[PDB]
Design an enzyme around this catalytic site. Structure first.
Site, PDB file in Angstrom:
ATOM      1  CB  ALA A  55      -8.229  -4.465  11.037  1.00  7.84           C
ATOM      2  CB  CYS A  56      -3.834  -1.946   9.439  1.00  5.74           C
ATOM      3  SG  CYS A  56      -4.982  -0.404   9.453  1.00  5.74           S
ATOM      4  CD  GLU A  57       0.113  -4.245   9.841  1.00  6.33           C
ATOM      5  OE1 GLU A  57      -0.080  -3.188  10.175  1.00  6.33           O
ATOM      6  OE2 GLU A  57       1.617  -5.515  10.245  1.00  6.33           O
ATOM      7  CB  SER A  58      -7.531  -7.992   8.324  1.00  5.96           C
ATOM      8  OG  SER A  58      -7.566  -6.428   7.904  1.00  5.96           O
TER       9      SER A  58
ATOM     10  CB  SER B 253      -7.709  -1.543   6.197  1.00  7.77           C
ATOM     11  OG  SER B 253      -7.804  -0.407   7.976  1.00  7.77           O
TER      12      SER B 253
END
Lengths: 413, 413
Positions: free
Chosen positions: B163-166, B192
């Site tokens: 996921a984005c900014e995980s 991501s």
């Protein structure tokens, strides 16, 4: 030898754009001090600043924190309804029969005469602002210079343009055989900067809520008035202006001063266009604001100085201005998606042609793109002009006017 | 020694997010091939991909261009209405009395057992997506891990987050004494990437309009299945994943694979969490798309393959999606202006804290900021999650909930 004529223009209205009319009044004061004549100097100014309700010095307009009035004696040539691109071109060509309103003072110059033009507000790629909801196109301005040269109306001309992306107005379309030299505040893809703002150094008088001047404009005027113009050359002004407007070579809070046209004119002394003040024997990094963001800065000062009677009214106006420019920005973005697809639309609309290349191949197509957009998405304001590179890129991509009609229809109708 | 359990989650629904459920089905196939058991593996998948009208292979779901069906035999543990953050936490804690719907299969693990978790869709700073219009908050996920450790539910745990900014989900809030190791697809401020997209290389089958996988997810699965996991360590997976997900160290089309928690677990062999396939003795720069932009890419393929009966319907839907995300983006921008002023609002909302520092000091205040925004500006979608750093920065600036209520009121009411 001959006569020194001048045309001074501010293409904006409102107290948020106080600086553009302040630059013009100072420039008029400068030229009169240098021995030019009222009849030979044409002033275009909406005339809504000096007596505006928000003015803490009624009938007074200042350009620097030293507080000298530059408004007194400035002639009302073309004001209000009269500040049009049609009158601008008529004044430059020197024909009273083509003028609509105003004083009627035009540049009816002889072949041995010299002309100095100064424009102050705003602009975008290939366009300049005009107060009565108008857009001045670069090719049209060039056309008038070509027509004036072809009838023998002057010997040499020097033009100074203060506006965002002012380099796009001459890059790839300005001839050098017109005996016209031009300097601009910025290059073809940059924005211009505002100075003497509330909450910055050098700080203007505390009673002021709007900024007083523009980085490039104040650089040349404060430079000419601190030097003997019988010694100073046109090139030496450009070098001092370029250095000041660059802001210690920090182009994140500066701009590139460019030069276009007949470059031999930079050897000539500034007094042949600006005159000389016989009194003048005498021969840090600034905090500046973006041109499109000084309106909100002014509005925020109004909000932070007011009380409740009224402070929630200013805040609602701030929201309406922000929503309006977010509608313009979002519609252009979507039109690019509907026309080129996601991931291809932005790289197409925001592409920048290399210097020396004209912004758009078809200038009449640029006018139809604006025409189609305003017919569905509503009027482009002075801020809205900023998408003129995207409209030009639409033309250069080969996309038809019917595809633009279908896109603006899906984006806003 | 013990038992290997697994929880596999896809936090998204719709055919535009086909890849997240495809990664999950493949991961389930991988773990079963490695000797794990159906009862010990919990699958969360909305279950709207395999029989969707837009599917060119009915009842078939693929993850790579080789076209192997990964859907067959995947268990319907928690589908549709059941894919909630409440059930996710209940499955992890191992309590059937707290589950609402579904198969009822939970992770009732013994102290000697090992757990592998895999999440695929979506996210933003401190948040993860859930299908039934939900937002999973980072602190809440950490709280469940702390509660599971405090009751002796496992020996070691390995979590993989796609996921984005995980990285914001663990940075500054993940303890190392929980015996949990975590790798994320991206750092705290990055997005991501999606792979196997229509119109890219390696090209998926031509009949497909939506992408099949995600850069980080396919990196680990295709890596574990091409190696003997009895030899391969957890650290060696991270190094191969990190290298693939970086995309030849081009972070303009790549992301940083990060590691958090108990780092001693990287010495352990991957077969202690993923098992081993007894058959496996065997021990260029990709074209990738942004996570938030693959929906529009899919929609544009639908538009470019359809005829008129219907193609203007898809184009109107593309405009409605774009207008909707331009409303979310513009409202957040304005709220920052109404709260901090122009020129200060954007630097406040888009500031990034240094690594190792938690995204927000008060996690309950982050939930109230979202609550206040959705009450005036309408629901945040999965795309809308992207402003979670701006909501957190609102909390850290000291601004009150009443100031947020007044701002959202002026911005949207």
């Amino acid at each position: 030898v001959g006569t020194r004529w001048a045309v001074l223009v501010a293409g904006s209205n409102g107290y948020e754009n106080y600086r553009h009319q302040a630059d013009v009044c100072h420039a008029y004061q400068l030229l009169i001090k240098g021995g030019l004549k009222e009849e030979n100097i044409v002033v275009f100014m909406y005339d809504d600043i000096a007596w505006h309700e928000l003015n803490p010095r009624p009938g007074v307009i200042i350009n620097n924190p030293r507080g000298e009035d530059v408004y007194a004696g400035v002639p009302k040539d073309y004001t209000g309804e009269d500040v049009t691109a049609e009158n601008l071109f008529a004044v430059i060509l020197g024909d009273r029969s083509k003028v609509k309103g105003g004083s009627g003072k035009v540049i009816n110059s002889k072949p041995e005469d010299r002309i100095f033009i100064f424009y102050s507000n705003h602009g975008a790629a290939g366009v300049l602002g005009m107060p009565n909801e108008q857009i001045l196109y670069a090719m049209d301005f060039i056309d008038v210079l070509k027509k004036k040269h072809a009838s023998g109306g002057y010997r040499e001309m020097v033009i100074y343009v203060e506006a965002c992306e002012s380099g796009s107005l001459f890059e790839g379309i300005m001839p050098k055989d017109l005996n016209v030299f031009v300097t601009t505040a910025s290059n073809a893809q940059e924005n211009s900067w505002v100075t003497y703002c509330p909450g910055t150094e050098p700080s203007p008088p505390p009673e002021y809520t709007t900024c007083l001047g523009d980085l490039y404009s104040v650089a040349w005027m404060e430079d000419s008035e601190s030097h003997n113009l019988r010694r100073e050359t046109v090139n030496q002004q450009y070098r001092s202006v370029k250095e000041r407007t660059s802001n210690f070579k920090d182009y994140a809070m500066g701009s590139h001063v460019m030069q276009y046209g007949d470059t031999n004119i930079t050897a000539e002394k500034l007094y042949l266009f600006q005159g000389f003040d016989p009194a003048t024997v005498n021969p840090a990094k600034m905090e500046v604001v973006h041109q499109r963001d000084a309106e909100l800065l002014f509005m925020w000062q109004m909000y932070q100085r007011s009380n409740h009677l009224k402070k929630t009214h200013i805040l609602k106006q701030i929201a309406e201005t922000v929503k309006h420019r977010n509608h313009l920005d979002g519609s252009v973005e979507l039109i690019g998606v509907l026309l080129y697809g996601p991931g291809k639309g932005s790289p197409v609309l925001q592409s920048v042609r290399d210097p020396g290349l004209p912004l758009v191949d078809n200038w009449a197509c640029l006018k139809s793109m604006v025409r189609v957009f305003e017919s569905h998405c509503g009027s482009l304001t002075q801020y809205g002009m900023k998408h003129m590179r995207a409209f030009a890129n639409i033309c250069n991509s080969g996309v038809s006017e019917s595809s633009m009609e279908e896109a603006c229809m899906v984006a806003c109708g």
